[PDB]
């Protein structure tokens, strides 16, 4: 379950209150803060890996009733979310830890915070950097490229 931390950010949208941070309690009993700018795993279908998203906004949406805690995200997509026919355009076999910045507006970016599984570390690498492949048996995901529905391209600014 989730709770806001502290005061809302200076108001921007009507009917919404924005927060920098959200508090998530586990059944391991502890409390974890997730902040705007951090990344989360988002529950998708039960047979698939979580979606990965960067949190770009956290908000209490007063336009739903009863009101809900929401996020707006920047999506990433996993290799398997890219059309099979377009996969070869990458020109290599990405590791399971590699994901792609999804640079397209067609999917809606608003989620309910209850779909959040938890934080994930996502790391931006230069194209010529190699993914570790180090130890920690890492839970970290790496991003090199964006995918626009047409081609792979550099990470946006």
């Amino acid at each position: 379950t989730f709770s806001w931390v502290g005061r809302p950010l200076p108001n921007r949208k009507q009917f919404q209150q924005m927060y920098r941070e959200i508090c998530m309690k586990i059944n391991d009993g502890s409390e974890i803060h997730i902040k705007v700018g951090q990344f989360v795993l988002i529950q998708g279908e039960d047979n698939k890996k979580p979606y990965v998203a960067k949190l770009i906004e956290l908000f209490q949406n007063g336009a739903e009733v009863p009101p809900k805690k929401c996020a707006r995200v920047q999506w990433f997509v996993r290799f398997l979310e890219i059309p099979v026919s377009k996969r070869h355009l990458l020109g290599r076999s990405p590791p399971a830890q590699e994901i792609f910045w999804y640079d397209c507006s067609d999917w809606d970016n608003k989620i309910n915070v209850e779909t959040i599984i938890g934080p994930v570390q996502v790391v931006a690498l230069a194209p010529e950097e190699v993914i570790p492949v180090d130890q920690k048996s890492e839970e970290t995901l790496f991003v090199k490229l964006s995918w626009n529905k047409k081609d792979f391209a550099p990470l946006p600014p």
Binding site: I42, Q43, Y51, W75, S105, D106, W107
Partner: peptide, 12 residues
């Protein structure tokens, strides 16, 4: 348990 998010279109 995390609720399921269903991605949906539009809303660009």
């Amino acid at each position: 348990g995390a609720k399921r998010h269903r991605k949906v279109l539009r809303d660009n």
